[PDB]
Design an enzyme around this catalytic site. Sequence first.
Site, PDB file in Angstrom:
ATOM      1  N   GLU A   1      -3.658 -14.293   8.320  1.00 37.54           N
ATOM      2  CA  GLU A   1      -3.414 -12.846   8.803  1.00 37.54           C
ATOM      3  C   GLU A   1      -4.289 -12.747   9.949  1.00 37.54           C
ATOM      4  O   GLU A   1      -3.772 -12.104  11.060  1.00 37.54           O
ATOM      5  CB  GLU A   1      -3.714 -11.786   7.666  1.00 37.54           C
ATOM      6  CG  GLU A   1      -2.860 -11.684   6.766  1.00 37.54           C
ATOM      7  CD  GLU A   1      -1.481 -11.239   6.930  1.00 37.54           C
ATOM      8  OE1 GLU A   1      -1.041 -10.806   8.062  1.00 37.54           O
ATOM      9  OE2 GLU A   1      -0.538 -11.241   6.056  1.00 37.54           O
TER      10      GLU A   1
ATOM     11  N   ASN B   1      -1.147  -2.512   7.391  1.00 33.71           N
ATOM     12  CA  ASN B   1      -0.290  -1.742   8.262  1.00 33.71           C
ATOM     13  C   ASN B   1      -0.371  -0.221   8.103  1.00 33.71           C
ATOM     14  O   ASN B   1      -0.170   0.316   7.058  1.00 33.71           O
ATOM     15  CB  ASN B   1       1.090  -2.107   7.741  1.00 33.71           C
ATOM     16  CG  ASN B   1       2.245  -1.633   8.655  1.00 33.71           C
ATOM     17  OD1 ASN B   1       2.032  -1.004   9.443  1.00 33.71           O
ATOM     18  ND2 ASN B   1       3.191  -2.489   8.578  1.00 33.71           N
TER      19      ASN B   1
ATOM     20  N   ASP C   1       0.107  -1.997  -5.981  1.00 35.60           N
ATOM     21  CA  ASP C   1       1.353  -1.139  -5.840  1.00 35.60           C
ATOM     22  C   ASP C   1       2.606  -1.633  -6.434  1.00 35.60           C
ATOM     23  O   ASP C   1       3.578  -0.806  -6.256  1.00 35.60           O
ATOM     24  CB  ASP C   1       1.493  -0.594  -4.510  1.00 35.60           C
ATOM     25  CG  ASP C   1       1.881  -1.534  -3.678  1.00 35.60           C
ATOM     26  OD1 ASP C   1       2.500  -2.470  -3.979  1.00 35.60           O
ATOM     27  OD2 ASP C   1       2.071  -1.292  -2.560  1.00 35.60           O
TER      28      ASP C   1
END
Length: 129
Positions: free
Chosen positions: A35, A59, A101
């Site tokens: 990343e 994000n 999540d």
Amino acid sequence: KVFGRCELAAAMKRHGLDNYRGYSLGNWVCAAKFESNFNTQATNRNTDGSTDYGILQINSRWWCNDGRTPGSRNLCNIPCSALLSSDITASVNCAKKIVSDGNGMNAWVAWRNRCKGTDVQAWIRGCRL
Ligand SMILES: O=C/C=C/c1ccccc1
Ligand SMILES: O=C/C=C\c1ccccc1
Ligand SMILES: [Cl-]
Ligand SMILES: [Cl-]
Ligand SMILES: [Cl-]
Ligand code: NA
């Protein structure tokens, strides 16, 4: 800050990522490598106008506020700039919510494409931690 490999591993473990949601430390180090190249100050603009911030390229579409992503959410309740600090706390705490999540580390497309299924322990091999 650009972390060394083992240095980041250590930091992640101190902040509670080692085996968080079942993901070993090498998974988290591998994700950060691809990343951000271990650079806390990394940013990248998404073609839709959201931006990814920090060592884990979190994000603004969902997770942080930068004031410039219409319609977005701020689920980590933080300014996106917090994700650029030399201290990785904010990035780690937000990553814990992301990975929880429902889709695990697949939230990080680059983890899915470059780390998932590989020998991720290589990322922490030899480290004192
Ligand atoms: O790499 C693609 C975009 C990079 C970038 C970084 C910060 C703001 C805008 C764009
Ligand atoms: O175990 C290897 C040490 C560093 C490194 C290099 C490439 C992949 C993983 C880690
Ligand atoms: Cl590992
Ligand atoms: Cl916004
Ligand atoms: Cl999972
Ligand atoms: Na946002």
